[PDB]
């Protein structure tokens, strides 16, 4: 059960006037592909906190990857879900590692060192690497039942050049005629459910692989494309929100950088 919205004032929209007209806004199954100018925040956020929406961020951060906590902790305070219910969940080899950072009211922070605890703690699952920072808004614009993320380094490429794996051999083939988009592994999520099933999907495919002697070119990426491909995502996020400056500058394309690689 959803409440009514209350009376907000903003533009109205335009239904003879295209959103963007440089990049596709939708995929062929009808999920929007999330870019800057295609949604209106202040919609989304009370459409979000009137459920009192939780959004659980996962990372793994195991051996000398503890020395990007700091920064991607700060800049999630910054940028992530900011108004809205979060716990992060840092999974590390080095508990007494993780750094001391402040957190915003409503946000808390587990540590577990290396589940059903997700579906009762959480309504949206956000798995992303450590390695990384927020550099502008990252939130409620991304959530839906299953998204992936466009890599950045593929997104004008067409299909035959996307790293797939290629072999028949193994559960994540893909053949050159087949695939939509190559996502990337390092941010992806959905409902807790979703996100549960294409992870046991995943373990699944990488553990009869195992047996039959190959891995995958890509490793989990390569299944995750392969889930994606089979299984297709209600939101695709652009590459805004998967970028590396360094390798790859800033294109007219992109009005904002929201999640970067580290220097
Ligand atoms: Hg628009
Ligand atoms: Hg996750
Ligand atoms: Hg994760
Ligand atoms: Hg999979
Ligand atoms: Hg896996
Ligand atoms: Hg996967």
Redesign the pocket.
């Known amino acids: 059960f959803m409440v009514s919205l209350p009376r907000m004032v903003y533009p109205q929209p335009k239904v003879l006037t295209p959103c963007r007209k440089d990049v596709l806004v939708v995929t062929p199954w009808l999920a929007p592909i999330v870019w800057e100018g295609t949604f209106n925040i202040d919609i989304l956020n009370e459409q979000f906190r009137l459920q009192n929406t939780t959004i659980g961020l996962t990372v793994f951060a195991i051996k000398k990857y503890v020395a990007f906590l700091k920064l991607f902790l700060e800049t999630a305070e910054k940028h992530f879900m900011v108004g809205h219910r979060v716990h992060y969940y840092v999974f590390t080899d080095q508990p007494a590692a993780v750094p001391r950072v402040t957190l915003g009211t409503g946000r808390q922070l587990s540590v577990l060192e290396v589940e059903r605890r997700f579906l009762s703690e959480v309504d949206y699952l956000v798995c992303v690497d450590v390695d990384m920072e927020f550099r502008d808004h990252v939130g409620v614009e991304i959530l839906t039942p299953l998204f992936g993320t466009l890599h950045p380094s593929f997104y004008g490429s067409s299909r035959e050049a996307f790293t797939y794996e290629r072999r028949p051999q193994s559960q994540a083939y893909i053949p050159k005629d087949e695939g939509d988009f190559y996502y990337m592994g390092a941010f992806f999520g959905g409902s807790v459910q979703e996100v549960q099933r294409l992870?046991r999907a995943?373990?699944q495919?990488?553990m009869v692989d195992q047996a039959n002697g190959i891995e995958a070119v890509w490793?989990?990426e390569s299944?995750?494309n392969k889930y994606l491909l089979r299984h297709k995502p209600t939101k695709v996020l652009s590459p805004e929100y998967l970028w590396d400056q360094q390798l790859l500058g800033w294109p007219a394309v992109l009005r904002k950088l929201r999640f970067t690689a580290v220097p």
């Open positions: 992870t995943c373990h495919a990488m490793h989990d299944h995750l």
